[PDB]
Amino acid sequence: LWIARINAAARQNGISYSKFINGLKKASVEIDRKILADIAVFDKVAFTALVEKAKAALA
Amino acid sequence: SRVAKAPVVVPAGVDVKINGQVITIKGKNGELTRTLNDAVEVKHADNTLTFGPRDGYADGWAQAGTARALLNSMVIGVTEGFTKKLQLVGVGYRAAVKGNVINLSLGFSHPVDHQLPAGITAECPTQTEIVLKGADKQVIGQVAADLRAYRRPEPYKGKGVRYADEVVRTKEAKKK
Amino acid sequence: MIGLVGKKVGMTRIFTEDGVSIPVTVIEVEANRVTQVKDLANDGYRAIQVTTGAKKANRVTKPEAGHFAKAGVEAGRGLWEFRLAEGEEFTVGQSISVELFADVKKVDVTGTSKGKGFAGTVKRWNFRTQDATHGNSLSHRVPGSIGQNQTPGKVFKGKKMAGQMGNERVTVQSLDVVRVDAERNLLLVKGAVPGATGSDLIVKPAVKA
Amino acid sequence: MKTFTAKPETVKRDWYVVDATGKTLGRLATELARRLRGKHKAEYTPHVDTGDYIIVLNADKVAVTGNKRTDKVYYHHTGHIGGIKQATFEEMIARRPERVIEIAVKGMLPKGPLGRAMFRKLKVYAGNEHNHAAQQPQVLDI
Amino acid sequence: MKVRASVKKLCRNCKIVKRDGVIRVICSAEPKHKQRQG
RNA sequence: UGCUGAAAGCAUCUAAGCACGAAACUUGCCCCGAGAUGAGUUCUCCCUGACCCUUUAAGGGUCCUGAAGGAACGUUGAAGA
RNA sequence: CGAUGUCGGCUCAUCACAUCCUGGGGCUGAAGUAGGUCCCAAGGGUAUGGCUGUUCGCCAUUUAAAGUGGUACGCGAGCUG
RNA sequence: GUGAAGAGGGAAACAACCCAGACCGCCAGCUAAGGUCCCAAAGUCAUGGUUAAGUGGGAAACGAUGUGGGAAGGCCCAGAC
């Protein structure tokens, strides 16, 4: 159910859950675990700036 | 490719009319002789014709070759037209007209009793011969074949309609 | 194109100069009263409420009484709403006589069949009984084998078995007109018609013709 | 204590209206089914939807990948005398022009009562005559 | 006329032209040579 | 079964533009059909009391008052176990 | 094997066609009337007597037809036995 | 070798094939074989080739201006198709 809430936001940003989680695992202490992942519904301007931070560690 | 790139050349005593769509040709045969396309363009320079696709479409010179095929016979259709070819042979088989309605004797309880489409009418100079009064290669081909479907030649008799585009034949008897 | 209602008075044989006696049914068609004409095309369709007879005022309730009040003081039972398509009829309430059939050759009649109750498979579907000669016991008025042995697991719906017969709507599809005289309320037809007092005998021109 | 919980009384819906005219059915079905379930918004459980109310007005003017219009049969088994009867796509879209869009999104939606609750948020016409103007539906081009 | 997926040319009168999606064969006087597909 | 004809200087029953092509099919005749919870269309009848409670936009009482309609009662049946 | 009624016929047909008839389309080494043959439509339809318990068999007579193939070599809380 | 005496994951159900071995738990994470269009969790991934067939998801013969992939030649601007 936390995977659904994260994947919905990733899809509304043009990124896939597999890439989003892998980028946040390639950066150190950025994954923050799904038990705190309310940032997938709190604010989308900040989520877009989290997707771009994950893209800066993914590739 | 080559047939869509042919100039056609308009003959003498002929008039051409066009308004961005539907090309019309006039001469000493027919009435209002014209042809339609919805994605192909047809245009006239001063004696030569050009065919091609509209802006935002491409035919590969295929449909331009199909439009050329019709307009290149329409210039003949309005100047000398087409020859006599349709005949019928056999005992009790006769061709006639009343008004513009055909009276076609083929051993039927109905003598076809038909008047054809528009810009096309029948005439019979002799009981053996059918003349088509028209300027369109397509309708004269279709009505000549609409009639060909009635009393198709019987295998050992070979009697009925003759039409010059094929040879009508009789089957060899045993013979007893 | 529409129809009429009228009451049966009997059946007889007219006799004809072809030797055949020609069995005929006699119907008295009093002009159909017309309770409402709907030429105004409300909800996209036109209609006429042709109406014949009335129900005793001790068995007419107010929901029905106000549905006949705008064309007369008598009310109840057969209102008969027919639809109108590809034909113009006079816009104001005016009764229709049996002269509606004075230029018609063929008709059909619809009504209600006699009560035949319980029936059973044999009297409902006119079905072949089992022979009681050379044995067979305890059942002879049954159809036999209601499904195809073991692999069905089930019976199919609406099959020719069981049910009750009569007391339902029925059509006779073709009758010949013989005589029409609207000054005498007369309709004379070649043939016979289904049912007695439960039958309303809705008569229509042939729509095939 | 639970981070978040899905509640069907808390889910609020407003009215929308879409175009079907000349639209490719393979794209119309995926976006319409996701819209009807809310699977273009934030998600949680599959046992509660987050959709909205949707009108289709011109439901048979769509375009399809069906290239041979005398194929398909649409059979439905009722059990009456073991029978079934066929209809082509060209005859089906003539009898039931309002039904093609519903059976197209049926492949994107769950079965039974949970599916029927979403099929009550979708309304269909083909006469292209608007009736719910007092609800003020929101107009969508894509 | 035999229902087949392959054709035989056995007389020189035959034109052997592709006609509506397949190769075909026919002869002016003899029905034995008419073949719907190859 | 064919007409006109392109992909393809030539050719073709096919691609585009077309006319024919069956008892059937689709329309058509008839009976049934809103559990079509998608509950449709239209007409017709009738009710004009007052106060109160709740974590009161929905439920629950008191006292007054009882339309349209229904059932019960009943003489019979070309309606019926 | 701590339970699997048998042969034909009747009785009920059912579901198909590698089509029996009917509809439609082509041939014959088919003059017509005949005899022989390829195959689209599964939409409408597809035998009785004699001898026998008989599938099989021979034998009398029809129909536009009596053909091919499946169903516990099709029907027993079905009939005949 | 798999089971019998080994649970679990894939193969639609599925001791025989594939994987891996079952003490308990987790306000904790990764992997095997196999998955990731809508259902039902995750790539409607990125890129080099192939395809109009439902091959994918029974099966030989055979032909072609359906298309993709090669090599060697003939006919030819002292002029070819």
Q: Which residues of C175-186 are buried (b: 16+ CB within 10 A; e: fewer)?
A: bebbebeeeebb
Determine the distance between A1 (CA) and H40 (C1') in angstroms: 13
Task: Copy the structure tokens of residue C193.
Answer: 């018609």
Query: For every residue of E1-38, which 3-state class applies, written as one string?
Result: CCCCCCCCCCCCCCCCCEECCEECECCCCCHHHCECCC
- Whether residue D3 and residue A35 make contact (CB cut-off 8 A), yes or no, is yes
- Whether residue C156 and residue D78 make contact (CB cut-off 8 A), yes or no, is no
Query: For every residue of D51-68, which 3-state class applies, written as one string?
Result: CCEEEECCCCCCECCCCC
Task: Copy the structure tokens of residue C19.
Answer: 């030797």
Q: How far apart are CA B116 and CA B102, in angstroms?
A: 9
Contact C107, C177 (CB under 8 A): yes
**For chain C, what is the domain count?**
1
Question: Which residues of chain D neighbour A2 with C-beta distances below 8 Å?
Answer: 3
Contact A36, D4 (CB under 8 A): no
Q: Nearest 5 degrees, angle CA C28-CA C29-CA C31? A: 145
- Whether residue D44 and residue A9 make contact (CB cut-off 8 A), yes or no, is no
Query: For every residue of chain A, which 3-state class applies, written as one string?
Result: CHHHHHHHHHHCCCCCHHHHHHHHHHCCCCCCCHHHHHHHCCCHHHHHHHHHHHHHHHC
Burial class, D36, CB count within 10 angstroms (exposed 0-12 / middle 13-18 / buried 19+): buried
Proximity of residue B87 CB to strand F below 7 A: no
Q: Nearest 5 degrees, angle CA D102-CA D108-CA D113? A: 75
Q: DSSP letters of chain D?
A: --S----TTT----EEEE--TT-BHHHHHHHHHHHHHTTTS----TTS----EEEESSTT--B-S---TT---------BTT------HHHHHHH-TTTHHHHHHGGGS-SSHHHHHHHTTEEE-SS-----GGG-PEE---
Contact C23, C11 (CB under 8 A): yes
Q: How far apart are CA A14 and CA D123, in angstroms?
A: 31
Tell me the backbone φ, ψ of residue D30, rounded to 5 degrees.
Answer: -70, -45
Pairing of strands B23-26, B34-35: antiparallel
Q: Which residues contact D62 (CB under 8 A, 6 or more apart)?
A: D20, D21, D22, D23, D24, D25, D28, D100, D101
Question: Which residues of chain C neighbour D82 with C-beta distances below 8 Å?
Answer: 156
**For chain D, what is the domain count?**
1
Contact B60, B69 (CB under 8 A): no
Determine the distance between B149 (CA) and F2 (C1') in angstroms: 9
Mutual angle of helices B137-148 and B63-77, in 10-degree steps: 90
Q: Which residues contact C51 (CB under 8 A, 6 or more apart)?
A: C32, C33, C34, C35, C68, C71, C78, C79, C80
Q: How far apart are CA D75 and CA D52, in angstroms?
A: 32
Contact B5, B72 (CB under 8 A): no
In terms of Cα–Cα distance, which of C121, C55, C100 is closest to C203? C100
Q: How far apart are CA B134 and CA B86, in angstroms?
A: 14
For D23, other C-beta atoms within 10 Å of its C-beta total 19
Q: Is the preceding omega at residue E34 within 30 degrees of 0, hence cis?
A: no
Ordered by start, the domain boundaries in chain B are 8-76, 82-163
Query: For every residue of B74-122, which 3-state class applies, written as one string?
Result: HHHHCCCCCCCCEEEECCCCEEEEECCEEEEECCCCCCCCCCCCCCCEE
Q: How far apart are CA B118 and CA B136, in angstroms?
A: 11
CA distance C153 to chain D (A): 13
Q: How far apart are CA D131 and CA B27, in angstroms?
A: 58
Contact C3, C47 (CB under 8 A): no
Name the closest nucleotide to B174, judged by C1' and CA: G31
Query: For every residue of chain C, which 3-state class applies, written as one string?
Result: CCCEECEEEEEEECCCCCCCCCEEEEEECCCECCCEEECCCHHHCEEEECCCCCCCHHHCCHHHHCCCHHHCCCCCCCCCEEEECCCCCCCCCCCECHHHHCCCCEEEEEEECCECCCCCHHHHHCCCCCCCCCCCCCCCCCCCCCCCCCCCCCCCECCCCCCCCECCEEEEEEEEEEEEEHHHCEEEEECCCCCCCCCCCEEEECCCC
HSE toward the beta carbon, residue D122, CA cutoff 13 A:
25
Q: Nearest 5 degrees, angle CA D90-CA D92-CA D93? A: 70
A13 contact D CB<8A: no
Amino acid found at C107: V
Give the chain D residue nearest A10 (alpha carbons).
D42
Determine the distance between C148 (CA) and G71 (C1') in angstroms: 9
Q: How far apart are CA A27 and CA A3, in angstroms?
A: 20
Name the closest nucleotide to A21, judged by C1' and CA: H42
Tell me the backbone φ, ψ of residue B11, rounded to 5 degrees.
Answer: -75, 180
C154 contact D CB<8A: yes
3-state secondary structure of B26: strand
B39 DSSP 8-state letter? S
Residue with tokens 């390639």: A26
Contact E8, E25 (CB under 8 A): yes
Q: Which residues contact C207 (CB under 8 A, 6 or more apart)?
A: C1
Cross-sheet strand order for the sheet of B15-17? B15-17, B23-26, B34-35
Boundaries of domain holding D40: 1-142
Q: How far apart are CA B80 and CA B12, in angstroms?
A: 12
Superfamily assignment of B82-163 in CATH? Ribosomal protein L6 (3.90.930.12)
Q: How far apart are CA E20 and CA E8, in angstroms?
A: 18
Q: How far apart are CA B132 and CA B114, in angstroms?
A: 14
> Sign of torsion, CA C123 C129 C132 C138?
negative
CA A13 → CA A20, A50, A52, A56, D61, distances in Å? 10, 10, 10, 15, 33
List, in sequence order, every residue forming a beta bridge with C108; answer none if it has no partner.
C204
H or E element that contains B9: none
B126 DSSP 8-state letter? S
Q: How far apart are CA C149 and CA C7, in angstroms?
A: 52
3-state secondary structure of B160: strand
Task: Copy the structure tokens of residue B115.
Answer: 């008047």
Q: Enumerate residues 104 to 133 of chain D having a beta carbon within 8 A of any beta carbon in chain A.
A: none
Q: Which CATH class, in words, describes the domain spanning B8-76?
A: alpha beta
Q: Nearest 5 degrees, angle CA E19-CA B159-CA B165? A: 35
Contact A39, A54 (CB under 8 A): no
Burial class, E25, CB count within 10 angstroms (exposed 0-12 / middle 13-18 / buried 19+): buried
Determine the distance between D108 (CA) and H37 (C1') in angstroms: 10
Q: How far apart are CA C79 and CA C96, in angstroms?
A: 14
Q: How far apart are CA D17 and CA D141, in angstroms?
A: 9
Q: How far apart are CA A41 and CA D41, in angstroms?
A: 10
- Whether residue D43 and residue A5 make contact (CB cut-off 8 A), yes or no, is yes
For B78, other C-beta atoms within 10 Å of its C-beta total 20
Q: How many residues does chain B have?
A: 176
Proximity of residue D72 CB to strand H below 7 A: no
Q: Which residues contact B48 (CB under 8 A, 6 or more apart)?
A: B7, B8, B9, B10
Q: How far apart are CA A43 and CA B22, in angstroms?
A: 60
Probe site for chain D from C157, C160, C161 (most D CB atoms < 10 A): C157
Q: Which residues contact B82 (CB under 8 A, 6 or more apart)?
A: B76, B132, B134, B137, B140
Query: Chains with 3 or more CB pairs closer than 8 angstroms to B?
Result: E
The helix/strand count (H/E) of chain B reads as: 2, 11
Q: Which residues contact C13 (CB under 8 A, 6 or more apart)?
A: C21, C22, C23, C24
Technique used by the depositors = cryo-EM
CA B44 → CA B9, B15, C59, distances in Å? 10, 11, 87
C157 contact D CB<8A: yes
Contact D140, D56 (CB under 8 A): no
> Sign of torsion, CA C65 C70 C75 C77?
negative
Proximity of residue A19 CB to strand H below 7 A: yes
Resolution of the entry in angstroms: 15.0
List, in sequence order, every residue forming a beta bridge with C46; answer none if it has no partner.
C84
Question: Which residues of chain B neighbour E28 with C-beta distances below 8 Å?
Answer: 167, 169
Q: Nearest 5 degrees, angle CA E1-CA E3-CA E6? A: 105
Domains B8-76 and B82-163 share a fold: yes
Q: Which residues contact C23 (CB under 8 A, 6 or more apart)?
A: C11, C12, C13, C190, C191, C192
Q: How far apart are CA D71 and CA D89, in angstroms?
A: 7
Mutual angle of helices A17-26 and A2-11, in 10-degree steps: 100
Q: DSSP letters of B48-76?
A: -EEEEEPTT---TTSHHHHHHHHHHHHHH
Q: How far apart are CA B104 and CA B93, in angstroms?
A: 8
A2 contact D CB<8A: yes
3-state secondary structure of B35: strand
Find and give the residue nearest to G25, measured CA to C1'. Answer: E1
